[PDB]
């Protein structure tokens with residue numbers, strides 16, 4: 001029912017003790033509280049479904065948040081996970097992850113691997129000896145300036161925008177004409193698909209201003225089981241400093257959440273590509289979770305509070 005919201009604070013980064021700044025964030029995992037030093041000894045505290053402190057490692061996030069959700073997907077449910085927060089707090093780090101330096105590990109064992117890679121690898125492990133018969137297909141579409149880009153098409157230039165239509169076989173669904181859905185036959189072909197995505201994104205960046213920060217990345221994985229059909233959408237949202245208290249999809253997401261939370265009969269899903277595509281994840285029939293990433297630096301006070309207030313109110317959304 002209620003959408004689950006969790007907070008994840010990134011740890012300090014070298015140049016983060018330079019420009020004068022102290023950790024104004026205190027996370028308490030057992031009490032599921034995040035406390036912020038707002039004083040200029042005053043503070044604001046918020047309780048979430050889960051709170052992960054700066055020391056939280058990727059494996060901890062997967063085990064605690066992802067595994068449970070993946071089991072749901074394998075059961076035939078639709079699930080979505082959002083990463084929301086200002087640029088620089090770890091949205092991509094959490095959803096995608098990074099490669100450890102000096103080629104110390106292969107992708108499947110990289111402790112810095114994020115949610116997407118771990119999920120893909122685990123699907124094959126969990127569905128290997130049990131019942132059996134299943135197929136996995138992934139797609140990675142990114143939204144920038146209300147235009148859709150396919151980061152997985154090999155036979156197309158990343159700059160070819162995609163067009164979406166309402167799904168005549170739906171009502172709340174849309175069709176993304178030309179979207180590449182790649183079949184992942186086995187764990188051994190997962191990484192190359194990610195590298196391909198990584199490459200096309202690099203190209204998109206040279207073409208579009210502040211691309212990686214303003215873009216909304218939607219990595220979807222659909223599992224056909226033999227029956228049952230489960231879909232997991234992993235969404236790395238545009239930086240929240242892109243709104244506040246330009247980016248039509250971000251603005252609309254916030255308005256959609258506001259409408260859902262106040263119980264207003266009209267929810268503006270159609271006012272943006274992002275909300276039309278993810279309509280069923282917002283007060284729909286999909287199980288939704290939001291991971292609000294924040295910074296410990298006193299310099300990010302304002303954005304951190306904004307993010308916490310935004311995510312906190314989101315816990316009042318009911319999906320089904």
Ligand SMILES: Nc1ncnc2c1ncn2[C@@H]1O[C@H](COP(=O)(O)OP(=O)(O)O)[C@@H](O)[C@H]1O
Nearest residue numbers: 009010011085086087088089090091092093094
């Ligand atoms: N939990 C984390 N642990 C270690 N480094 C992190 C974490 N989250 C973010 N970082 C670092 O902070 C910087 C920005 O992370 P990034 O994922 O790009 O944020 P965002 O996607 O929200 O813009 C990079 O150095 C990234 O490795």
Ligand SMILES: Cc1ccc2c(c1C)CN(C(=O)N(C)C)C[C@@H]2c1cccc(O)c1
Nearest residue numbers: 096097098107110112113116117194195198
């Ligand atoms: C959609 C997606 C998901 C995850 C990830 C990338 C992309 C595009 C790109 N990455 C890459 O570094 N490349 C080069 C694919 C980072 C990353 C990842 C994958 C595997 C293991 C790991 O430790 C980090």
Ligand SMILES: [Mg+2]
Nearest residue numbers: 091092093212
């Ligand atoms: Mg990012």
